[PDB]
Write a protein that binds this ligand. Structure first.
Ligand SMILES: Nc1ncnc2c1ncn2[C@@H]1O[C@H](COP(=O)(O)OP(=O)(O)OP(=O)(O)O)[C@@H](O)[C@H]1O
Ligand SMILES: [Zn+2]
Lengths: 224, 373, 256, 84, 191, 133
């Protein structure tokens, strides 16, 4: 015997394993096979709205156009300035989209390594606690600075001799608050181009306007 | 083993002609004329004394047949619980035939209608919520067997008996009335089912037009054999909110269970005016008086307000409460059953509309005929 | 389930050319071919379809044949060349249905759980739009018969596409653009007064069919109910519209 | 066993299931391989840069011609392989 | 090899589930499909084999196709249950063979009947002289149980043929315990 | 040899499958085959523009799969009629639709296949009712 049930379980196990694995691989190549006919679209940006059907956009690569929405694009979402998608050929607006990121911002956004906090530094607790007073108090409790009714400070300039831990102070805050440390090294900004670094400044200030508790840092200003 | 029918071959007059044949049925290993023989054991006119004997042998038929449908096994375990008269051994057998049977012909719902069919002794509150609802949860494939829909009336109507949702006797009545098609059970019990169908349909007041579908055959054959006024006072709840002989004749004949719903039957005649005043009357008259609402409604002047506002709580009408003269303005209403004279007079004013708009249409086209080119 | 359809006339010509494929040979009953379709929303679309050989003998209306191998091979071709397309149902050219059509429908609902048919007419003169949609579902019955499986008239329309009439309106050559202001209104007057109220007279002919006949499903469910939606206006003699002539004067006011 | 002989009928039945395994596996396999022969043999490949990967599984492309293109459909890669 | 077309008419009625025949009646009719499908493998592969039934429906799952390993996969979950109507089984088998690919194929059809059919001898003589006017030879193997000696299908055998066209061979059912290969051992000898 | 004035009859489902085919593959040139009937010398009809499978690497003569010729044309034989091909279609969406070098590369193959082998050129973005592209 009665080993035919064992041989039937062996051939059924290998056959069902080959069917599930290789046919499921034909399902992954079936979905990946279905996505072959798709064509990428155009990144455009709405300059303004002309009429109910006419729309003034300018794509990033060059000239200006007026087209219409598709059917259900929800034209009230088209505020002047939004990033939308255009057809390659019809060139009409395909889909209202969220904003661009310029991942040079991301290369200083997600590249904050781990660090020991402000206990590792010492002897400059005036700068430590004072920086806590100027930064952490208006972001946590603005109403102490609003009960008096006077504007809190915004910008701070670390200076002194070389190697007084001016880097590792902001690094220890970057292991203390851990919110949105946009640490600009401020020497790899310019590459060759004309208003490219300017456009990076606009993107940093708009993204900085967006994620409301942003922390701007800029090392080595003297190059720029 | 044939020795079980050597001792159980005697069950009635002329009996072993199917037992000496039966020992050719299963000994010659055919099992579907033995499915007809399980149908014969369901059929057997006796005290049904051998079913508690045969039940282990039918368990054996389920063992070394292992293909037949357990519909007839439920139909024989109702006989076995009729012979043994205790549900718990067929609850062990019921859970047994629920855990060992996964047969392709709707084994799960015959098991849930086995819980519904054997539910009558285990109490009908702890369990009617879970598995009676699980019958139509498991009826997701195909509600067209009509055995599970008739039994589904049976368990859903025991759920009507243990009182919950009186107004579910209309849809529950659409499950018996929507299960049975030809009479297939005695008329001299059916007319009592139409008797309590009108009574419990009068208890369930959510649809309030209970003479709605009464060109239905396996109730109307009972409408012509029951007391004839009960249908007529359901027609005094369907058409005419008058004849105190009728809407009081349901107090003359039907003594109990009237005062519990009596003000709401006053409410139902006080919406029966609301179909009368614009359905039957010429057009709307644009403004309908407290004498019409109150006189048809057999109520005072100072209840037509609560009548029409309560009608706006129902939502059958959207009428404006014109009571600067106590004379109510009309809007759209939900209609009532189209009678044949309503068909014919509807053809009169409807054909009147048809050939007037068409005739005057052709006249306007005749005036505009010269400007085409 | 279905909201409505979107049907281009291209697939209707894909019915017409196969009607030319069968009009030269012995036409037994009619055409039954595949209706491919683009189903995205509860609305429908059809850009293409194809046909398949079919005969039927009218003795039990159950001996009838398609080729599912041909259907899935050419469906493999068309699915291969277009990943958007899938089957959505079938069609028939004889404008009246019959009893076998539920066996056609339910026999091809195994591929997709809906299989909508299309009535067309190769010689239409009386209908409005040719296209028609059903769905084979149940309202059980009021009496609850054993599965009264019923076609349901889902509403239907001619679909449209940008740059599909590049052939069409160049072909026909007869179009008078913007006849607003001249006689289009009275074309619609003759055809809606006459061709609306004659349909009203066939509905009152069906009312006489309920008088002398019509006990089948006398239909006291939808007829007086949506006819009470019609009876929002009981326009009897004396006309009762005193609250509509200052309304009419307000309507005539600004235009005059 | 009789259950052993019916189990041998289940062994030939599982052999038919192996024939369906090679059929549905190798058939749709080699077909979709041929579609990858069509798509993936387009050997001039404009390399580009990932700007963002939106999730509405979508990505925005900056070509080496310094231009922008949107795609809602990523392609023959994984989102884990796509860092900014 | 030889050009023909054979439409296997399996029985899927609720009598074909028991074990009076060798182990399973599904196995009896199934092994009958095995020997006729391997028999058409031994015949011309230009010929085509398609499945049809008589009970509860006239089921075309496979086209009348020269492939048969697909039908070998269609041996599974046949579920014999329903009400026999073989009289439409002749006509559905015939227009099933009137949507063929070539007329050089002859028309010799087998049939698998295993339940009492409500067939009139007038009905099978309309179908039988219909097949006189349609040039089809049908060799029926009775399964299941309808008669210990099948009579109406004997009348279909007699009324199908005369003097030239005796391609009506009727293996009447031995409805008691008989083998899965002893019933089909006679048509593989002579159809 | 002496040569008579020719003529191309249409069935206009040709034009519908060109607008729908070139509309479907609108950012790309397509290649296909045109079916019809060789009626005589001075006329020839197109009765079927039918779908032809995509090339991804190169729109060329290798876009004609011969097993799609046997399977496609044979399943047209078991469609209502086995009619004869009358040529071949393609598209040029990217420009004003003139004869690419592919067309002269496969024209000798197409007239090795057929008598006439008449081109079909189109830009699918031209008009909505007007142009005869
Ligand atoms: N107060 C301190 N506590 C702990 N570690 C310190 C301290 N000061 C300096 N260090 C260590 O010595 C390193 C030198 O500091 P670093 O030079 O990065 O600061 P800085 O801002 O770069 O000064 P500068 O840029 O002017 O040369 C720090 O990165 C840290 O590892
Ligand atoms: Zn080209």
């Amino acid at each position: 015997k009665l080993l035919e049930h064992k041989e039937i379980d062996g051939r059924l196990k290998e056959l069902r394993e080959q069917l599930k694995e290789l046919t499921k691989q034909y399902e992954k190549s079936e979905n990946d096979l279905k996505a072959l006919q798709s064509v990428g679209q155009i990144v455009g940006e709405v300059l303004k709205q002309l009429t109910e059907e006419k729309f003034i956009v300018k794509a990033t690569n060059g000239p200006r156009y007026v087209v219409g929405c598709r059917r259900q694009l929800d034209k009230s979402k088209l505020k002047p300035g939004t990033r939308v998608a255009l057809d390659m050929t019809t060139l009409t607006i395909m889909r209202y989209l969220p904003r661009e990121v310029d991942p040079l911002v991301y290369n200083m956004s997600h590249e904050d390594p781990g660090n020991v906090s402000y206990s590792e530094i010492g002897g400059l607790s005036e700068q430590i606690r004072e920086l806590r007073e100027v930064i952490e108090l208006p972001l946590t409790n603005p109403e102490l600075f609003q009960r008096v009714g006077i504007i809190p400070p915004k910008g701070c300039l670390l200076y002194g001799p070389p190697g007084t831990g001016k880097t590792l102070l902001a690094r220890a805050v970057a292991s203390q608050l851990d919110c949105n440390f946009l640490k600009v090294v401020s020497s790899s900004i310019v590459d060759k181009y004309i208003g490219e670094s300017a456009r990076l400044i606009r993107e940093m200030f708009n993204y900085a306007r967006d994620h409301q508790p942003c922390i701007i840092f800029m090392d080595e200003i003297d190059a720029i | 083993v044939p020795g079980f029918l050597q001792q159980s071959q005697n069950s009635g007059p002329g009996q072993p002609a199917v037992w000496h044949r039966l020992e050719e049925l299963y000994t010659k290993k055919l099992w579907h004329q033995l499915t007809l023989q399980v149908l014969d054991f369901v059929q057997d006119p006796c005290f049904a004394q051998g079913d508690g004997l045969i039940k282990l042998y039918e368990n054996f038929i389920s063992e070394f047949e292992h293909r037949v449908n357990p519909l007839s096994l439920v139909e024989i375990i109702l006989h076995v619980v009729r012979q043994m008269t205790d549900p718990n051994v067929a609850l062990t057998f019921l859970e047994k035939t629920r855990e060992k049977v996964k047969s392709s012909d709707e084994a799960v719902i015959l098991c849930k209608t086995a819980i519904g069919a054997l539910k009558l002794n285990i109490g009908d509150l702890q369990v009617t919520k879970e598995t009676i609802e699980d019958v139509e949860e498991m009826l997701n494939n195909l509600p067209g067997v009509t055995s599970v829909h008739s039994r589904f009336y049976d368990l859903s109507s025991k759920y009507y008996q243990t009182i919950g949702n009186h107004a579910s006797y209309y849809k529950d009545a659409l499950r018996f009335l929507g299960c049975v098609d030809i009479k297939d059970l005695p008329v001299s019990e059916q007319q009592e089912r139409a008797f309590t169908l009108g009574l419990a349909g009068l208890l369930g007041e959510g649809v309030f037009n209970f003479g709605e579908l009464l060109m239905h055959p396996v109730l109307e054959s009972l409408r012509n054999t029951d007391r004839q006024w009960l249908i007529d006072t359901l027609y005094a709840f369907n058409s005419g909110n008058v004849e105190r002989f009728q809407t009081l004749k349901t107090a003359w004949g039907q003594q109990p269970d009237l005062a519990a719903n009596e003000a709401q039957l006053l409410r139902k005649i006080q919406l029966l005016c609301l179909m009368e005043m614009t359905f039957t009357r010429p057009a709307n008259h644009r403004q309908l008086t407290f004498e019409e609402i109150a006189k048809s409604a057999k109520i005072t002047v100072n209840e037509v307000e609560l009548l029409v506002m309560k009608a706006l709580s129902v939502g059958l009408v959207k009428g404006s409460i014109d009571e600067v003269d106590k004379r109510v303005h009309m809007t759209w209403v939900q209609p009532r059953v189209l009678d044949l004279q309503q068909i014919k007079g509807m053809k009169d004013r409807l054909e009147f509309w048809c050939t007037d708009v068409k005739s005057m249409e052709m006249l306007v086209e005749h005036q505009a005929h010269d400007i085409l080119t | 389930a279905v909201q409505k359809v979107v049907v281009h006339p291209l697939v209707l010509l894909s019915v017409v050319d196969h009607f030319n494929r069968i009009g030269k040979v012995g036409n037994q009953k009619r055409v039954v071919g595949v209706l491919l379709g683009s189903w995205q929303k509860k609305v429908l679309d059809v850009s293409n379809s194809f046909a398949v050989p079919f005969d039927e003998d009218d003795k039990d209306d159950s001996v009838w044949f398609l080729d599912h191998d041909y259907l899935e091979n050419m469906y493999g071709m068309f699915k291969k060349v277009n990943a958007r397309e899938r089957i959505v149902g079938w069609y028939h050219t004889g404008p009246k249905l019959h009893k076998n059509d539920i066996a056609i429908n339910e026999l091809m609902k195994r591929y997709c759980p809906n299989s909508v048919l299309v009535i067309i007419d190769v010689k239409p003169k009386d209908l409005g739009l040719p296209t028609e949609a059903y769905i084979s579902v149940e309202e059980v019955h009021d009496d609850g018969t054993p599965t009264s499986k019923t076609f349901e008239h889902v509403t239907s329309e001619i679909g449209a596409e940008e740059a599909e009439e590049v052939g069409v309106e160049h072909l026909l050559r007869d179009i008078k653009d913007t006849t607003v202001g001249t006689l289009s209104q009275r074309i619609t007057n003759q055809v809606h007064g006459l061709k609306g109220l004659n349909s009203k007279l066939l509905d009152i002919r069906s009312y006489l069919e309920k008088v002398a006949t019509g006990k089948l499903p006398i239909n006291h469910q939808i007829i007086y109910q949506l006819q009470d939606v019609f009876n929002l206006l009981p326009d009897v003699s004396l006309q009762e519209f005193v609250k509509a002539f200052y309304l009419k004067t307000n309507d005539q006011m600004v235009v005059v | 066993r009789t259950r052993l002989l019916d189990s041998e009928i289940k062994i030939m039945k599982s052999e038919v299931l192996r024939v369906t395994h090679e059929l549905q596996a190798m058939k749709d396999k080699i077909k979709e391989n041929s579609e990858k022969i069509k798509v993936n043999k387009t050997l001039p490949y404009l390399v580009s840069n990932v700007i963002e990967l939106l999730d509405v599984k979508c990505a925005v492309i900056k070509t080496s011609t310094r231009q922008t293109y949107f795609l809602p459909v990523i392609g023959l890669v994984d989102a884990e392989k796509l860092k900014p | 090899m030889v050009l023909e077309s054979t439409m296997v008419c399996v029985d899927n009625s609720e009598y074909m589930r028991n074990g009076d025949f060798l182990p399973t009646r599904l196995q009896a009719q199934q092994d009958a499909v095995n020997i006729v499908c391997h028999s058409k493998t031994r015949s011309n592969p230009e010929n085509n084999v398609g499945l049809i039934t008589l009970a509860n429906d006239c089921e075309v799952l496979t086209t009348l196709t020269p492939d048969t390993g697909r039908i070998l996969s269609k041996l599974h979950t046949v579920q014999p249950k329903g009400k026999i109507t073989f009289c439409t089984g002749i006509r559905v088998a015939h227009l099933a063979l009137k949507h063929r690919q070539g007329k050089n194929h002859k028309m010799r059809i087998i049939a698998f009947v295993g339940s009492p059919v409500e067939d009139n001898e007038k009905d099978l003589v309309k179908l039988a002289k219909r097949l006189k006017k349609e040039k089809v030879n049908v060799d029926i193997i009775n399964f299941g149980e309808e008669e210990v000696n099948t009579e109406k299908l004997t009348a279909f055998v007699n009324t199908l043929n005369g003097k030239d066209g005796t391609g009506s061979h009727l293996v009447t059912v031995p409805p008691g315990p008989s083998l899965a290969d002893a019933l089909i051992s006679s048509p593989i000898l002579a159809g | 040899a002496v040569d008579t004035a020719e003529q191309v009859y249409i069935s206009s489902l040709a034009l519908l499958k060109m607008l729908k085919h070139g509309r479907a593959g609108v950012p790309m040139e397509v290649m296909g085959l045109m079916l019809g009937e060789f009626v005589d010398d001075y006329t020839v009809r197109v009765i079927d523009v039918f779908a032809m499978p995509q090339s991804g690497t190169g729109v060329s003569v290798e876009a004609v799969d011969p097993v799609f010729q046997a399977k496609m044309l044979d399943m047209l034989k078991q469609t209502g009629r086995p009619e004869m091909v009358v040529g071949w279609y393609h598209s040029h969406p990217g420009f004003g639709c003139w004869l690419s070098g592919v067309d002269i590369n496969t024209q000798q193959s197409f007239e090795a296949l057929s008598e006439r082998a008449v081109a079909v050129v189109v830009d699918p973005i031209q008009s909505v009712k007007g142009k005869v592209v």
